[PDB]
Write a protein that binds this ligand. Structure first.
Ligand SMILES: Nc1ncnc2c1ncn2[C@@H]1O[C@H](COP(=O)(O)OP(=O)(O)CP(=O)(O)O)[C@@H](O)[C@H]1O
Ligand SMILES: [Ca+2]
Ligand SMILES: [Ca+2]
Ligand SMILES: [Mg+2]
Length: 1011
């Protein structure tokens, strides 16, 4: 069966031997499972290891160090080419820092993919089928669907396999198949066969494809292909590498990356220029071209040192960390920019039903009319026990057990709930619980019919399975459903045209209507009291609405629904059911029967989440299509409003919002916190009004009425137990429906930006000190304190792992107390620019002072004066200004080792400053980031290694230091902490919990270094 769209519905069902009513057997499914297998696609390997490494070396900042490593190679291969001892050490230390950052980036990217893939199996994909075990619809796993079984699918569902449409229950069926054919509109389907055997998928009507969603309607069909035999499975090879747009923060770092490479080039050009007079010095052999090449290597080695080469890698691991940290909290992050954009979210619009509430509805009370005075009416208000979907409960009239058969209004109320219902109740023998098949509002009515049991049937000898739809089957055996005017959110109602099967009374067909109590009652002209009908007046209209308003605004905050019937409807011939606007024209002159109120408890984590968002400057707005009285009462429960807060201008309806010119409509959208009774058209309109104020909007939803708003918001967050239409229009999915994961995603997105600013602060405060070290030496006339191979050792030790370990920084202590960040402001602030220069100027002066100390004040070194150190090039044995000074000590490796050791040490102490922007080290000790402690101990281990290992001091032109000289290195390196603790102190006090184990740990160190 490969061309099913060209065959009649009877011909396809005959091919499988299946009936559309009873379904498929279980001896047939066992045979079909062996010949066809499970309905699932093989797992894709994704980005391979080699491809994942190539993406690390595609940024400009990494391509400079690649070219500089090539320059250092071709410049060291022409002099002493056949060598490996000291010639090719400069290109080697340039490549080690590149492969170190490439390993961390690939390993962290591989971790985020593994956590995401392990989250796809959180809850298995399910599918509704008809099988001969039960006479009702049952949920099974989508992988256990075999070709040939009857599958039922409704609005919002995801088509589990290729389905030949057998019967459409509603007036029309729309399917969103942009995933397969690429058309951005819902396609209308039918049940008639198409003649063309080679029709394209756009022309393949009467066929629903796996992976696509049902946009509107309800239908059933027979599966014709599963697994790799579906249209979306046969094209899984046509999966080209999509152009993933850069994160809006990555665009800020790319502009900053090219702006920094332009200023670094001007700095390296200046280094080669300010040293013109040193080209023909005797150190280089008196040759100009020999000295010009030497200072070209200092400029190249300074470019590698000054350029942040781990910046494209650290943004990779941070975004990869945010994805893995969210997948551990059961949150599927589809779009990479989504977790970073949530850190700047200012408004969180949220669906109420199914999103802020558990969606575990249960009809707990109802009422019918007892007797009509003529101006007022007495109501027979009942109550029902039970909070789950199990059909075990008791109906009480006045807290006394009552039987529903003696009330003819209850018999009629149960009939409307049974027939005007596109849902059912399923038993789960694996879990031992009754679960819903369809919407929660309708299954609550399906379970209510079982508890009422208006037609007293023997319900004791039936199993758990046959008790889910026992009382409903009795009602549906009495009335024959003709067609369904499906639920449309413009009228907020739904009717069903039923005909009584009994020909004895010869009753004409009726229309059983259920919907929102506000609109349905307005279309009601009569009221059903007991078994007789009496015309409705405006006095009894107030009594019915007042009870419903008490239910919604009460303590239980009930979700109400009115039930009505139409005694004399038009025939099917006169009704024009093609369009949907005529449906409200047939739901007129109704007879009000009763109203039901079902409880929908909010989720436990919602109340604490709204409190954390308000503290973080975020605003939570409830966009619901439910009643205003129910919405405001839920908002007072979850914390959006106070239990006595006035909401005269913070809660609006769809009608009240439209009856407002754009003047007041604007100033009401940023001040409101609850929108009730809004269509899917309004929800996206609310979201675009909030984006008009330059606000990052995050919409959270579960149903098809939220997909237009989920597409317009910057971030769309879908619930895991929601419809597949909402989960398709969303960037993040809460697999466990935990609303507290949203605020964790905001804290994580703010952490990605914080780790970025600390990385920038560390590689600019430090690398400026390496640039100042070279220019300060030149302006003072001192001997050069660093050679190219040592400028490349500082880059490896300081710009390597101690810089990437900043992406593992812990969140700040005030991370979620600051207002949301505006993504339009510049990356680096003007105050941060001062903090970079203030630290760098000390790092540079400390490195020059370390070399100047040995030449002037050290005991082992000469006691050379400041004049002789500044004019060291003019020293000969005939100069009376240089007496006793052996002027071969100006090339000694001691001052170059003091400067190399101070540069490395002062940058490790500057990394300890880069754990937070303003929190001191006594408040956030360095062991809160253990990846940084290990990176510093490794960098200091490698520094001590080249100082004392057999051949290495010769390769780097350094000499081993003693304990007295190492105490001097620490004397100058430690004040870089005190300088940044001071700059952090000013930012806290004048611009914007001391750990005693840390204070007591550093005091034996601080007193030792300074005596
Ligand atoms: N199957 C159904 N049949 C008839 N009326 C329904 C219905 N489902 C919901 N309604 C009613 O239509 C009204 C508005 O439609 P809507 O689809 O927006 O409700 P909803 O359950 O989605 C609230 P939310 O938007 O917060 O999820 C609801 O208040 C409800 O009373
Ligand atoms: Ca560097
Ligand atoms: Ca550095
Ligand atoms: Mg909802």
């Amino acid at each position: 069966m490969e061309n099913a769209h060209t065959k009649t519905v009877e011909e396809v069902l005959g091919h499988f031997g299946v009936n559309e009513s009873t379904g498929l057997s279980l001896e047939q499914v066992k045979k079909l499972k062996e010949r066809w297998g499970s309905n699932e696609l093989p797992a894709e390997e994704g980005k391979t290891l080699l491809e994942l490494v190539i993406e690390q070396f595609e940024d400009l900042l990494v391509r400079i160090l690649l070219l500089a490593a090539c320059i250092s190679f071709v410049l060291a291969w022409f002099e002493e080419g056949e060598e490996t001892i000291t010639a090719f050490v400069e290109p080697f230390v340039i490549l080690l820092i590149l492969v170190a950052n490439a390993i961390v980036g690939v390993w962290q990217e591989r971790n985020a993919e593994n956590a995401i893939e392990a989250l796809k199996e959180y809850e298995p994909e399910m599918g509704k089928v008809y099988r001969q075990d039960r006479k009702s619809v049952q949920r099974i796993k989508a992988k256990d669907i075999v070709p040939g079984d009857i599958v039922e699918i409704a609005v919002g569902d995801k088509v589990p396999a290729d389905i030949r449409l057998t019967s459409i229950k509603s007036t029309t069926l729309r399917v969103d198949q942009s995933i397969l054919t690429g058309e951005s509109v819902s396609v209308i389907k039918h049940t008639d066969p198409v003649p063309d055997p080679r029709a394209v998928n756009q022309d393949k009507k009467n066929m629903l494809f796996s992976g696509t969603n049902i946009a509107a309607g309800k239908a059933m069909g027979v599966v014709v292909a599963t697994g790799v035999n579906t249209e979306i499975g046969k094209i899984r090879d046509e999966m080209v590498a999509t152009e993933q747009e850069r994160t809006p923060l990555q665009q800020k770092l790319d502009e900053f990356g090219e702006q920094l490479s332009k200023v670094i080039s001007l700095i390296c050009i200046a280094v080669w220029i300010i040293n013109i007079g040193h080209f023909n010095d005797p150190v280089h052999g008196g040759s100009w071209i020999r000295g010009a090449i030497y200072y070209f290597k200092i400029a190249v080695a300074l470019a590698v040192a000054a350029i942040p080469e781990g910046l494209p890698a650290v943004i990779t691991t941070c975004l990869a960390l945010g994805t893995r940290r969210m997948a551990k909290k059961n949150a599927i992050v589809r779009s990479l920019p989504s977790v970073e954009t949530l850190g700047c979210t200012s408004v969180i619009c949220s669906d109420k039903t199914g999103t802020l509430t558990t969606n575990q509805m249960s009809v707990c009370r109802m009422f019918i009319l007892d007797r009509v005075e003529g101006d007022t009416c007495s109501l027979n208000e009942f109550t029902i026990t039970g909070s789950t979907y199990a059909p075990i409960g008791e109906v009480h009239k006045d807290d006394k057990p009552v039987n529903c058969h003696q009330y003819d209004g209850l018999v009629e109320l149960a009939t409307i709930c049974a027939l005007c219902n596109d849902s059912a109740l399923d038993y789960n023998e694996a879990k031992g619980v009754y679960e819903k098949v369809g919407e929660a509002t309708e299954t609550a009515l399906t379970c209510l019919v079982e508890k009422m049991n208006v037609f007293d049937t023997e319900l004791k000898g039936l199993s758990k399975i046959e008790r889910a739809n026992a009382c409903n089957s009795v009602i549906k055996q009495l009335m024959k459903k003709e067609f369904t005017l499906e639920f449309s959110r413009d009228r907020k109602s739904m009717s069903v045209y039923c005909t009584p099967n009994k020909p004895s009374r010869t009753s004409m067909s009726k229309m059983f209507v259920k919907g929102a109590p506000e609109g349905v009652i307005d279309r009601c002209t009569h009221i059903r009291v007991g078994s007789t009908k009496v015309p409705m007046t405006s006095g009894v209209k107030q009594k019915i609405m007042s009870v419903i308003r008490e239910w919604g605004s009460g303590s239980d905050t009930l979700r109400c629904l009115a039930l009505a019937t139409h005694d004399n409807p038009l025939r099917r011939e006169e009704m024009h059911l093609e369009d949907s606007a005529n449906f409200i024209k047939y739901e007129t002159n109704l007879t009000f029967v009763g109203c039901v109120g079902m409880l929908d408890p909010p989720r436990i984590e919602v109340a604490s989440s709204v409190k954390l968002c308000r503290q973080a400057g975020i605003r939570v707005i409830m966009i619901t299509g439910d009643n205003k009285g129910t919405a405001v009462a839920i908002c007072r429960r979850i914390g959006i409003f106070g239990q006595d807060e006035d909401v005269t201008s913070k809660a609006f309806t769809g009608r009240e919002f439209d009856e407002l010119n754009p003047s007041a409509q604007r100033d009401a959208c940023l001040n409101a916190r609850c929108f009730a009774r809004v269509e899917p058209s309004h929800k996206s309109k609310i979201v675009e009004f909030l984006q008009s104020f330059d606000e990052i909007t995050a919409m959270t939803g579960d149903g098809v009425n939220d997909a237009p708003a989920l597409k317009k918001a910057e971030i769309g967050i879908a619930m895991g137990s929601g419809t597949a239409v909402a989960k398709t229009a969303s960037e993040m999915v809460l697999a466990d429906d935990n609303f507290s994961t949203i605020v964790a995603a905001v804290e994580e997105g703010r952490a990605i930006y914080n780790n970025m600013k600390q990385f920038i602060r560390y590689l600019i405060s430090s690398n400026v000190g390496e640039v100042v070290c070279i220019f300060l030496t030149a302006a003072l006339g001192f001997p050069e304190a660093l050679i190219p191979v040592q400028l490349l050792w500082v880059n490896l030790v300081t710009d390597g792992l101690p810089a990437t370990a900043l992406g593992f920084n812990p969140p700040d202590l005030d991370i979620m107390n600051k207002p949301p960040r505006n993504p339009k402001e510049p990356l680096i602030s003007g105050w941060l620019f001062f903090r970079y220069l203030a630290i760098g100027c000390y790092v540079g002066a400390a490195t020059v002072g370390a070399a100047a100390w040995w030449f002037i004040a050290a005991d082992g070194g000469p006691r050379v004066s400041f004049y002789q150190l500044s004019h060291f090039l003019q020293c000969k044995e005939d100069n009376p200004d240089f007496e006793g000074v052996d002027c071969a000590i100006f090339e000694s490796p001691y001052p170059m080792t003091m400067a190399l050791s101070v540069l490395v040490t002062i940058e490790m102490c500057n990394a300890l400053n880069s754990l937070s922007e303003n929190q001191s080290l006594l408040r956030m000790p360095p062991w809160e980031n253990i990846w940084l402690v290990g990176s510093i101990c490794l960098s200091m281990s490698l520094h001590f290694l080249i100082l004392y290992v057999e051949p290495l001091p010769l390769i780097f032109q350094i000499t081993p230091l003693n304990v007295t000289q190492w105490l001097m290195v620490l004397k100058i390196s430690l004040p870089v902490i005190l300088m940044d603790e001071t700059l952090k102190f000013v930012a806290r006090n004048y611009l914007e919990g001391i750990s005693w184990p840390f204070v007591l740990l550093i005091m034996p160190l601080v007193i030792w270094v300074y005596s």
